[PDB]
Write a protein that binds this ligand. Sequence first.
Ligand SMILES: *[C@@H]1O[C@H](CO)[C@@H](O[C@@H]2O[C@H](CO)[C@@H](O)[C@H](O)[C@H]2NC(C)=O)[C@H](O)[C@H]1NC(C)=O
Ligand SMILES: *[C@@H]1O[C@H](CO)[C@@H](O)[C@H](O)[C@H]1NC(C)=O
Ligand SMILES: *[C@@H]1O[C@H](CO)[C@@H](O)[C@H](O)[C@H]1NC(C)=O
Lengths: 164, 161, 162, 321, 321, 322
Amino acid sequence: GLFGAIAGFIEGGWTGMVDGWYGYHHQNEQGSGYAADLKSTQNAIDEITNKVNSVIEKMNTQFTAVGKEFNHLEKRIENLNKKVDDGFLDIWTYNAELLVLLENERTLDYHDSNVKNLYEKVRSQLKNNAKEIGNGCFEFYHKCDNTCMESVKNGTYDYPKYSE
Amino acid sequence: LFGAIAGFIEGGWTGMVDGWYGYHHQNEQGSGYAADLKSTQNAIDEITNKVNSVIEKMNTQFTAVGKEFNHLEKRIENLNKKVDDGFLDIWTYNAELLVLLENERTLDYHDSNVKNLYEKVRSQLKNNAKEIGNGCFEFYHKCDNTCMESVKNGTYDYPKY
Amino acid sequence: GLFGAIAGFIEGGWTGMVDGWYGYHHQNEQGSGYAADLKSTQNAIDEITNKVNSVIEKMNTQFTAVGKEFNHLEKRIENLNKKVDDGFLDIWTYNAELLVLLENERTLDYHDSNVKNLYEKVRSQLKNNAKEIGNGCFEFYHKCDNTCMESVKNGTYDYPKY
Amino acid sequence: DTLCIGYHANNSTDTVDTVLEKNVTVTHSVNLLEDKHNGKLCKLRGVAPLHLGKCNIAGWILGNPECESLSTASSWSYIVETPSSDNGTCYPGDFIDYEELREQLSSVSSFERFEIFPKTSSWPNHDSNKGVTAACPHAGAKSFYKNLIWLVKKGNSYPKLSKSYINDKGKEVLVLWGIHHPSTSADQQSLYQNADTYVFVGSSRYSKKFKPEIAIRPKVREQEGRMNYYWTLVEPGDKITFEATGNLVVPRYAFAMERNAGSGIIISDTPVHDCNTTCQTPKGAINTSLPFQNIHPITIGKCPKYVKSTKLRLATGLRNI
Amino acid sequence: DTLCIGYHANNSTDTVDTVLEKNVTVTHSVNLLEDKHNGKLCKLRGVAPLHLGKCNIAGWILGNPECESLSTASSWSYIVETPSSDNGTCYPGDFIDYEELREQLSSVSSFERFEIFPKTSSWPNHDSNKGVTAACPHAGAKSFYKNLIWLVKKGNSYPKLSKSYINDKGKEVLVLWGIHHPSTSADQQSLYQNADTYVFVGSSRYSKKFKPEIAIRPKVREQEGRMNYYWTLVEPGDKITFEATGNLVVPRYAFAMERNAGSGIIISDTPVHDCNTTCQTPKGAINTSLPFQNIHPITIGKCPKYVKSTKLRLATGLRNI
Amino acid sequence: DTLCIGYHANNSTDTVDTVLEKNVTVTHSVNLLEDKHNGKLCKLRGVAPLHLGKCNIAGWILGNPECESLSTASSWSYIVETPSSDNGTCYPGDFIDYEELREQLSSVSSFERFEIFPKTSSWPNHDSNKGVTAACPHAGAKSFYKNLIWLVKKGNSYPKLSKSYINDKGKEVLVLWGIHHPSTSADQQSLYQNADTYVFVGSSRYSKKFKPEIAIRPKVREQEGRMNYYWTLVEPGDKITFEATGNLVVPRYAFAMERNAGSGIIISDTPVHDCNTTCQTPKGAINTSLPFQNIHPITIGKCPKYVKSTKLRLATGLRNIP
Ligand SMILES: *[C@@H]1O[C@H](CO)[C@@H](O[C@@H]2O[C@H](CO)[C@@H](O)[C@H](O)[C@H]2NC(C)=O)[C@H](O)[C@H]1NC(C)=O
Ligand SMILES: *[C@@H]1O[C@H](CO)[C@@H](O)[C@H](O)[C@H]1NC(C)=O
Ligand SMILES: *[C@@H]1O[C@H](CO)[C@@H](O)[C@H](O)[C@H]1NC(C)=O
């Protein structure tokens, strides 16, 4: 979207991956399968959770009793009171509505970013040892086994293995 | 924020008037500017929904601000004045900052769309062309009109160099 | 972060660089040392300063005297007055608290962006003449002297050899 | 052979502001701030406002001789009153709960004026023709309020009067009356003939016994005497009773009325017109969908929030180069 | 051999809104808006509300014969009053500063009702047994307020009475009394026997001299007379003095009281229950930590801000595909 | 040969909060929240406040004997009143529209006190020397308000008095007066000698006829009687008329006055000083450009918005690390 990753060059999501928000789908000789990223998904959850908690926790209100009583000869201050109620009604309705619109845009861009960054951390790690498909998928040139995929997920990837 | 607009692509094209983002081909069959169909449409649709959100979400109550008080009601008159000035400061500040914030985001939104447009063609012409650095790509095989199409349409999928 | 640069592929910062926010650390035959980017740091300072000034300057208030007096037979309008005070108290407390949370997130992403962009401006300038380490550091293949580093910082980098 | 990538640009000079940078030129932009009005006082819903012209509220309901050319409107969304309108209570006095009455009259759904106590048949024992004053001139000649009658003694006789009205209308009835305070005990007897008098008004909710306060006040409009004005709303089915031994300015006309709360009163020279609006200000109406306006703090209707800003320009396009 | 990178997805249909795009499906989302209440009137702190049932505040403190409800709560967090409760001032009259009294009674920390002027020993020179009316029926028979006594003449004699109470309680004492206005001068003497009477109530702060206003009011509950009700708070150590030559409805019961400001009064048919809540609305309580609610504008306690929104769904996951 | 890229760091321990993460250390940061005041009551514009000291507003304008020591200020931006000031209406009574009077006196542009009805020439038919009370002591001796005169009968005679003042000043004139209510009908005649009396005050706008309410009130300051206080503003060119057959506490001094609305009244022990401020609170002044403050909800002037926050630290630099 804003980072090009989600709904961008990576068209869709995987109903197959249920371990986390972002992950991988390997395809070697030992088999296939989906595997979500440990570290990446954890940070997102921790940070998104803190986000929801911030929008909530920062709202601590005063003990007040809205609502007042006025007799037939106090219509003015009754309408004053009504104005102060309607005023707060408009300020909070508008702010809340826009707060959700704004933060929903940012949250979606936040996930888009995390995917882009995940893609980039792997790409700048397999310069020659693999090629860009364009679908967010990389095609190896040397053979890559299970212990090989590990060095990519763990970020501990040896690159002195340039083959063809 | 994304490096594209006013970044590595220094300026804009007064020549392109079809949309917000587009291309400028230069082959044997000629030149000319051509805006991106899909990309510009989404921007317009999304920017429009943005303006409509800032507006539509403001539905107010039918109220008659303004009250009358006699010389022996100066207090509640000043109370009333306080409730008016209070709302005056809350809305003035929020509106002013809302525009500053959303203007920063809108400009970054267009910057993003250009960057992404640049990236969608770059990851499509790895060896078949080279990066100039001015947001412009130089082909190595000859590229005709039907060739440029496969780039704009994203169907550059049967690469023949 | 949000752009991957700060606290991302460039793990830490340099206590050695004290000229600006973003810069370089060369390592050639003529020696080493840190040198902050002139143009990049200036814009950040100018723009971050305008940001702080915007959050402040846009708050010009009315001359008003909060606080009213009411006798024992005006407890209602006193509580009305209390409501209008507590109301403004909650609106401003919440907005200010969130304004700082939101803008702090954006400011950190703004610095992250500036670094990423600085890294990209150098990378798209030394395609073959150097290689990506992955630590935000580039390793040259031809020898690069002091006048050479200049053409990178200044963005005026020729490409006439291997 | 090359393929470049870039963005739009044009002759636009529209500038906007951002948190980071000021006066940034942009390809396209809209305005969130409304700063334009039609300079007219329009209809607030489907109903037009009640314009009092040269008179204010007081002079209107009491029936000031100068406020003849004005009101039989069945309803109004709000009330307009020119800053140059001074014709109100022509006979110096105090209008009790005046501001409150205005607020309750600011908007009505139905409003018919009927003769509550016909002048010919209601007061056989008192004189209902001498009650005029120089303070209320109608063509140089001495006159008085049209909706009130100033009862005086009928030839050296002022019997305890006791009239009452029962609200057979299907709505509240606004009843106005007056209590006259002579300047001298000489005028008191010359007017009522009893030196110590009282007046009592009562309904199912209202009750008060007035005692004339005889003394010399500073001259206002040639009057050293004073005349206080009182009003009340009589519930449907309820009845209001008048009783007096003098000093009572009785009601001649009342008002069947149905009020819809939530309106105000505009004081402005701005012309009234046959136009529709959802938001009204003293300077003119506002036909806008924008969230904010800097035209006027005082507003009536479903209006945009009043902001102190001079410009709220929201960028929609991108940087221009 | 390949290694791909992607993101989560599922059967979720949760939609949210963004500034840029509407109705976007996401994997996970929470709701910021509270729109659910328990449909009960609960306790506001640790203390339960005072439910008046078929009576309103007036009928409760005056001691209306029907208002024998929740005999003696020591305290309450707020007061509940059904829209169908009409039993208040059964004898037609005006309750002075009534709304103000309600606000000050809305919440109380301690509240004991004691006999300030015992009926047997306090009024030896007046009759304290004939003071009843058809307007205040208790079982078809003529009765009166329990907390007030309608003193009348003791066989053709009404001596100047002069009682006084000194506040020996450790708190404010709410004292209520009444001033009776007969319809006819005949009823005046038949009741007190002195034609021109006065009543004076006074403390260290309160002082006022009442004069009976004798006249015929429209009939309310068979009464052409009226009875106004007055109240005052007597400081600890201070004393209140009553003095009258007639027309005084004396206090029989008072109230030792300690008020804690900052509460209100709910008018609702909603059942009262034995439950805890931090926020109360007329429709029911709100047990939530969310910042916003669209249940009711009128609220009591530490409550979420009332918003007009129908849904405030905050995205937490990412796009769903 | 290498060329690396990185960012700044230092000894900074400044922590800030973000929507995503708490307690984040940063290189540089500013504070948006003002939490510091000078602990003084300063001048609000160019004008200093009116400090009443041991007296409150009532005792000040009425002329309580104890409030002799600091008034004749031509103007003030606001009024300061110590929580320990009890010297007001020394003679037990009710000050009508008192709170309203305070609000209209809170700030004044010009304020001169003149003798509206000179004591020697204005009341030839009444005694203007016996009007004193133990409730208003000046040095153990019986005294009374300085700006009011308690007229009593001149030897078994109280003729209908009828004085009037016409506002020749170029501004509103605050006129205060009193109505005395004796405790017993015996005191009534002993004081005025007419058993049934009345008092009437009237201008072009004001009008009211007072009737003395004779009865025994509980004792306050030795007084079983009461004395109510009334005030009105007389327009320039207009005249106010007094008429009474007794029980009237006539005005001796009035006040030529020009009020500028939009101020308040501070009740505080905080010392008054010769300093400038744009914002004032009961605890002290606030000299800040910041948008928010948590010093005090009650404020006077162009002040920052009161916030409940304990800290509003806005990050300006970046994350701090080795
Ligand atoms: C209607 O209003 C006019 C204008 O205020 C009144 O005439 C004025 O009366 C004042 C008071 O005596 C004079 O000083 C002005 O010179 C008058 N103006 C004019 C233009 O004559 C008039 O009295 C009002 N009519 C009624 C019936 O009260
Ligand atoms: C999108 O969803 C909202 C959420 O309730 C719904 O109200 C609306 O109908 C939808 N949009 C349109 C145009 O119908
Ligand atoms: C109590 O309320 C009922 C219902 O309105 C009414 O009819 C009745 O007269 C009242 N009784 C008393 C004693 O107030």
